[PDB]
Amino acid sequence: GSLAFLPRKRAARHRGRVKSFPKDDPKKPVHLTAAMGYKAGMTTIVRDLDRPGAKAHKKEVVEAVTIIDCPPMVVVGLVGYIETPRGLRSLTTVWAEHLSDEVKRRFYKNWYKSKKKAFTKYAKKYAENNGASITRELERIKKYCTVVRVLAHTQIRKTPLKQKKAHLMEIQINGGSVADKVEFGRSLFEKPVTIDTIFEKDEMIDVIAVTKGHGFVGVTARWGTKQWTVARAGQMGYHHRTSVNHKIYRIGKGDDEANASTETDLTKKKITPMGGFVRYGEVNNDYVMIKGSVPGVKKRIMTLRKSLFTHTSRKALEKVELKWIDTSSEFGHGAFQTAAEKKQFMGTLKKDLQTS
Amino acid sequence: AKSARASRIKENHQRFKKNIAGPVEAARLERLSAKLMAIAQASGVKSGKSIGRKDSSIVFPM
RNA sequence: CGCGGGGUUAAGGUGCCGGAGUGGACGCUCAUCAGACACCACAAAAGGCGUUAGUACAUCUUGACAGCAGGACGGUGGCCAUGGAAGUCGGAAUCCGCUAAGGACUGUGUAACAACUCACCUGCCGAAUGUACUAGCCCUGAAAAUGGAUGGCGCUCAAGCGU
RNA sequence: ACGAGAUUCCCACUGUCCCUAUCUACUAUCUAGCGAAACCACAGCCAAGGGAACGGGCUUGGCAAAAUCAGCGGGGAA
RNA sequence: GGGAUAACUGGCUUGUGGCGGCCAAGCGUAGCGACGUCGCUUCGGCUCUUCCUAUCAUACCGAAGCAGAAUUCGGUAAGCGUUGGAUUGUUCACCCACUAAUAGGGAAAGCUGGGGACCGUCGUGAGACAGGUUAGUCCCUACUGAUGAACUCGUCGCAAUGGUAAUUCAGCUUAGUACGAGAGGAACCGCUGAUUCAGAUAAUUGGUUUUUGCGGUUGUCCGACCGGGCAGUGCCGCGAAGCUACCAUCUGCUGGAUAAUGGCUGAACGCCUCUAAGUCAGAAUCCAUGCCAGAACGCGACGAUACUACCCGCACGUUGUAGACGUAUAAGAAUAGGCUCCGGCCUCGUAUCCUAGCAGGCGAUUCCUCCGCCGGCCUCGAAGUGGCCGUCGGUAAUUCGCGUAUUGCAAUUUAGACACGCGCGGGAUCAAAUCCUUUGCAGACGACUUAGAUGUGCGAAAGGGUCCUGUAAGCAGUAGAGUAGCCUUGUUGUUACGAUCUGCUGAGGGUAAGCCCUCCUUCGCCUAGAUUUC
């Protein structure tokens, strides 16, 4: 096996941390870096390839893509860091007024029995002429910090998940003066940020998630067998992984009602498979169609971040043209893309006449 | 073959990052920042402009 | 060599572990894992355009060593041999003239010449040089395989070496 | 000709293998009750040094943080 | 038969033979004598992890009639790899290929095939003996994973340290170009794949089936039908879901400094020199980033903190302190130079500041000097403070008056700072976690992701969808092979049974247990009870 992933222990957290944001210079415009989504499943697409020099040039190729449900994130805070001889240090963070119930659920282990008063005194700071305190923290970030990050949380009431406790993370603000990005973060308070604004089509991203667990496994399946360097039994899976160079093929809007339609096939259909995504449900929000496979089980929190370096391949900066998107059922050997297509093929049934 | 950390490959990648990948990613960043710009734009002591004090050690306790 | 108190020493030490000197004098040495007492082996009449002291011989205002500007000529393409061979693919002799000096030629070069260069000589410059050995210290003088050892940190006009 | 005799060759089959994957039952696991034995100077981290190619206790370094659960087989003359 | 002896090697080993003569600096005062030259010639296989370099390949360099291509010799380099068969005829055991290549060793090790020694007797030109005796010694730690008390619980982070990852080949273009008499025949830039390795993933394809889901069928049984039991899952077909497969799919990233070597300026050494001072480039090398873990005695930011006592003021402690007693003092930079007030100054911090008073009294005389607390305005973020102004309080720079005794001739001159605790009197707040039930993104057990307080809630049914199987039970049609009665001949006589076929019927059955949805689709449950906490 590989000694670069040697401490094969369970991840300390279920969310997964970025661990590196792309290097910042003030010349680029102000932008965000990362976002969160929920893994929905996989589907098959047909792509009109435009790869000069390849055997499949000017031909149709069938590829596997993964769907990540991406409801808009709400910006509810701002954090500032300073450079020290001991690394980066958090100087102060400025929260927004009027936090939602979901983001407060993250702060509690027993939300149902609690007297929900998180940030109750902090809200009075805004509205009781202690706005000097809020501005003093904002000015402190401007004149002392070198990196400013945004606290954004998901909206899982839109996600078909039984979990009600949202997910917080810090997203770095890159490309600008420290003063410019602080005004950027304050203006984003209490506001939803959509995925098509953070990323876009035919760009290559990195995804961070915790892998599927397998429990106690022996040497045959853990280390791949035909001291610290000797294969042993232990935990396999549930490991933090950072996969890079995954191309976004499509960003769906959710309100389009024709998300899975292309310029080639004129079928008004959404991305959700016939009968729903197996073990997940229906994607009713913005979604990111990522090529290939991505670490994590279905309905697992998914961390999307930008590439740390400018790309060196023609796989990037190449246009992606879609011909057809599969929507047939994943619960079996499906053969119908729409409910209408099934009824047209089989005619009318005994129950159809009895009801009518 | 030439390794991934070869000096020559780094030089070729550096030219590619500057002459092909650079302009494309710069145009992409302009469009993305414009969309986020649209969403976002949609006494010193008594005002906080004079940044004052809020609310193990490094020196020996004298 | 009984149980205790005080004083002084031996071997060994006084940069910190560690009690006592970052003590004094004059020198030597820079090592791409120096050396800090093993001095036996590797190891020799050994390799060093490292550095210091010394011995012997030799050249020098009659101008020494280095350099720069010039000469480097004639018999004569000496004899044999070679398709060709003139100082310079080879064999053997290797003399004389003009000389300040210049090999029947030390290398480059031509098919053969030509041409360049060296030896050697002169002018300019100006005071000290050359060769070979000896003795110190320094580099190399052969090393495998878990990560480790002047006891450790570390030490360079030393905290190394000699008195 | 005969032989649960041996060998070679030919056809056929096979998770023997390329190269593994899946499934079932009893264990392994946790609980209630019951409940031993082997063995035991005292202990238990590594490296270099400890003339008798001998170290586990000495030297001098690396170090070094309570209490636990499961897996293993590395160590304990001629 | 007796004597000495347990046995060997440990800065061991490696690439260049011995003998004789000639030459030979020296030592020496004949003898030793190197380099050269001449003369004569038990064994095999199996392995995993790591290390070494004495490098087979891949990277980079120096040289060679090295035109190109292919090479050969050498240097730095261990980063990265180093195969599949035969062993079935003969031998010094070694052929077949594939590949970029099919390098050598150490840790010296276990499995697997090949291939005993003493007396006794009878004899010794020599052996024989079923004659006797006999040795054959489940725990701790290491590693891999999982929890964890103390710091109130939780949320978001930093990154010391430890590990570290990519590899080789091919094809297109350059190009039938450079080069070459011909035959032949490259490379940089650019583009696309594949091998090995590594990390993931289940759309699709294949595999697997206790979904015992549906169907078929054997034997036996429930009296027959229907519906079923048993055959430790009877056998057969399909079979979702889950798990998996270079049998499937996706992804594998960039800066600095160097080695060999090639250079620039330039002494040594009046030429010269890549080196001495200075300095440029340069390998798959080294160090980091990207990547993995997070110090359970490293740190930061934030939220809410019920009591206790959270904050503030002062009152003390028979409270703890690797150790107050003036715990006083900010330029930066050079050392073959620097500072300045621009006059000058610099070995020298043996300097500057502060420094008197019942442990520091009281009252004056006299003074605007110094110290302190509070506010207002600002400034200090590398582990966060100081300045300015104002109020009030204290204040020998000069000089006096009153007081000190008795602690008895010394006995730490109990006196500082931080932290902790006990008390008042002023302000402020009315919290969480765990057990429990639940979830399966998780799982040996703990742990983890969840949900439980009125809700887009939880649970049980039901309806719909999506998948699996393959057309249910029953009824009916002379469609129907065949088996039998009625009367008398039937050229079309009738009546019953009748396997099978057809229609109702892509029907019936199953469907989350780790599939999807719910407009009032129906029914029910709810603000608990127990422990602990600054």
Alpha-carbon distance of A1 to A223, in angstroms, equals 5
Q: Where are the beta strands (DSSP E) in chain A?
A: 31-32, 34-48, 60-69, 73-84, 87-95, 147-153, 168-174, 191-193, 204-210, 215-217, 234-236, 240-252, 287-291, 301-305, 322-325
Sign of the alpha-carbon torsion through A176, A181, A183, A185: positive
Q: Report H helices in A189-244.
A: 195-198, 219-222
Identify which of A133, A200, A316 has the shortest CB distance to residue B32. Answer: A200
Expressed in Å, this structure's resolution amounts to 2.7
A257 is in an annotated binding site: no
Q: Which of A190, A192, A227, A340 lies closest to A274, judged by CA?
A: A340
Instruction: Provide the 3-class DSSP secondary structure of residue A40.
Output: strand
Q: Are strands A234-236 and A191-193 parallel, antiparallel or unpaired?
A: unpaired
Look up residue A232 and give its two tokens: 């042993």
Structure determination technique employed: cryo-EM
Nucleotide nearest to A166 (CA to C1'): E450
How many C-alpha atoms does B45 have within 13 Å on its Cβ side?
1
Q: What is the CA radius of gyration of chain A?
A: 24
Which residues on adjacent β-strands are paired with residue A217? A234
Residues 300-329 on A with a CB inside 8 Å of B are 309-312, 316-317
- Is residue A180 classed exposed, middle or buried when 0-12, 13-18 and 19+ CB atoms within 10 A define those classes? middle
Which of A84, A135, A187, A312 would you mutate first to test chain B, the one with the most B CBs within 10 A?
A: A312
Q: What is the distance between the alpha carbons of residues A63 and B31, in angstroms, rounded to a whole number?
A: 28
Residue B1 burial (10 A CB sphere; 0-12, 13-18, 19+) = exposed
Residue position matching structure tokens 């954090």: A79
Helix (H, G, I), strand (E, B) or coil at A84: strand
Q: What angle do CA B60, A84, A305 make, to 5 degrees?
A: 145
**Distance measured from the CA of protein residue B23 to the C1' of nucleotide C34, in angstroms:** 57
Q: What is the 3-state secondary structure (H, E, C) of A286-324?
A: CEEEEECCCCCCCCCEEEEECCCCCCCCCCCCCCCCEEE
In the block, tokens 């098509």 appear at A196
Q: What 3-state DSSP class applies to A260? A: coil
CB contact A30 to B (< 8 Å):
yes
Beta strands in B1-62 (DSSP E): none
> Does A253 lie at the interface with B, CB-CB under 8 angstroms?
no
For residue B50, how far is the Cα from the chain centroid? Answer: 27
In whole angstroms, E149 C1' to A12 CA is 20
CB contact under 8 A, A136 and B37: no
Q: How far apart, in whole angstroms, are the C-alpha atoms of residue A198 and residue A208?
A: 16
Collapsing DSSP states into helix, strand and coil, what is residue A281? strand
Strand A322-325 and strand A168-174: the pairing is: unpaired
- A196-217 b/e (C-beta count within 10 Å ≥ 16 → b): bbbbeebbbbbbbbbbeeeeeb
Cα(A156)–Cα(B12) distance, integer angstroms: 45
- Residue A207's nearest CA partner among A296, A298, A309 is A296
d(CA A141, CA A182): 8
- 3-state helix, strand, coil split of chain A in percent (to 5) is 15, 30, 55
Residue A49 token pair: 């390839």
